């Protein structure tokens, strides 16, 4: 999928996690987020279209999604363990990674 | 290892999982598949032999193995947490990821 | 952070794990190691500075940190279930992955 569609999937499911009441909604949303994060790694964002494909900026872009995926992993295991509020608090901390990438590359 | 040997590792251990009897075989097989998936990221497939290692097809290729590794991760936790049958089911669903990369780059 | 600081974070936290008393200390140190491994993957090491950013060496360097991160994952899960000695032994085996990269790119 396009980068913006993957971003839509990340944002829509973050909202689902924040509003969620049970572990099933959270786990389902985090699984969708992981898939969108990895697929976004394949994209070149418009602001880096003037960069080499292995420039430090594109490596930084791609590793940002590895960092997001590992944060999603921690939240997803908490959701699996039934720790709904902890899984939601971990999903809130995802936003630092969202924001940091946007600051550099949106 | 080179790409073909990692692919044999993937194929052989997928068969071990399909024909497994105990959790130890499945856990051991999935850990070997993850290792092989990550090692395969270092390779250049013959159909991309001449392209540049940072071309979008090479990025798509390498991210295919992150996706495979994360799907292996879910199956390995199913094996580690008991559910041998559901791990084998998840291992079987990996073939969709195997096949999607093969359609493009094999 | 730069590569050398991330390397000292890896080494310091491996020391912390070796002298830890309880699982919380081991888990917290492994998460710091995971953060540093991913941040170091963004770096260009001195030995490859005069190579193409898209060189096969640079890809091999970055995949090494994926392999480290996934080994840290298994150690971290041992710590989460409270298996202190088992987590410490797995942390100790990380040194094989540390050294394998150093042999090539130190
Ligand atoms: C880089 C490593 C990023 C991470 C991590 C996240 N996002 Fe992102 N996002 C990124 C870029 C480069 C862009 C620009 C897109 C464009 O082509 O215009 C975006 C965009 C968004 C958007 C707006 C999409 C649109 O409608 O145009 C949203 C809503 C968004 N991103 C959300 C989002 C969330 C919720 C994230 C973490 C959970 C997140 N992004 C991470 C790059 C990166
Ligand atoms: C891309 C991201 C791939 C994923 C995921 C999987 N495979 Fe693959 N495989 C890929 C390529 C480019 C090739 C061709 C290699 C070559 O040198 O021709 C292959 C090949 C195989 C083979 C045949 C190996 C041979 O000796 O010719 C097998 C048996 C194989 N692959 C199995 C396999 C399995 C079981 C996978 C998922 C669990 C899988 N592959 C994923 C690229 C990619
Ligand atoms: C490649 C994939 C590596 C892995 C995995 C690990 N290290 Fe490393 N290390 C690497 C390089 C290229 C370098 C040289 C960096 C430089 O700028 O000089 C290093 C260096 C170190 C150091 C010294 C850092 C310094 O102060 O200059 C330490 C203490 C170190 N590495 C430790 C370490 C540990 C404990 C690792 C595994 C847990 C590990 N490294 C992995 C490349 C790679
Ligand atoms: Cl790359
Ligand atoms: Cl990568
Ligand atoms: Co896990
Ligand atoms: Mg489009
Ligand atoms: Mg759209
Ligand atoms: Mg679209
Ligand atoms: Mg000092
Ligand atoms: Mg010291
Ligand atoms: Mg010191």
């Amino acid at each position: 999928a396009d980068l913006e569609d993957n971003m839509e999937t990340l944002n829509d499911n973050l909202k689902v996690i924040e509003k969620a009441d049970n572990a099933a909604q959270v786990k389902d949303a985090l699984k969708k987020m992981r898939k969108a994060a990895l697929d976004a790694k394949k994209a070149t964002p418009p602001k880096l279209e003037d960069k080499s494909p292995a420039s430090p900026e594109m490596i930084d872009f791609r590793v940002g999604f590895d960092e997001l995926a590992w944060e999603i992993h921690d939240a997803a295991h908490l959701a699996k363990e039934g720790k709904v509020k902890e899984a939601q608090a971990a999903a809130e901390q995802l936003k630092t990674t969202c924001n940091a990438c946007h600051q550099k590359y949106r």
Side-chain angles (χ1 to χ4, degrees), chain A:
Chain A
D2 308 338
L3 178 60
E4 286 168 272
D5 290 336
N6 285 324
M7 288 307 145
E8 178 169 39
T9 305
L10 290 172
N11 198 35
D12 290 349
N13 279 282
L14 195 44
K15 295 172 183 184
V16 167
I17 295 163
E18 293 160 353
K19 288 146 86 119
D21 296 312
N22 55 70
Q25 305 168 278
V26 180
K27 284 161 54 176
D28 168 88
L30 285 166
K31 192 186 216 332
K32 294 170 177 161
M33 289 180 79
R34 190 182 77 196
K35 176 197 198 182
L38 297 168
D39 193 59
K41 218 178 153 190
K42 316 177 171 151
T44 299
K47 181 164 179 182
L48 302 183
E49 282 168 6
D50 63 339
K51 295 285 154 70
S52 290
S55 57
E57 292 85 3
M58 286 294 309
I59 302 312
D60 186 36
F61 176 80
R62 286 203 278 277
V63 172
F65 292 108
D66 297 320
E67 290 164 328
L68 197 67
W70 279 110
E71 282 161 1
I72 288 160
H73 162 279
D74 291 4
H77 270 297
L78 291 164
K80 194 240 62 164
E81 302 179 328
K83 308 185 183 160
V84 177
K85 288 206 172 289
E86 280 184 54
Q88 286 174 315
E92 269 301 302
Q93 290 295 109
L94 263 40
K95 293 175 166 180
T96 303
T97 302
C98 308
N99 292 336
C101 187
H102 295 160
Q103 196 279 321
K104 286 179 284 179
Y105 305 120
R106 182 149 72 184

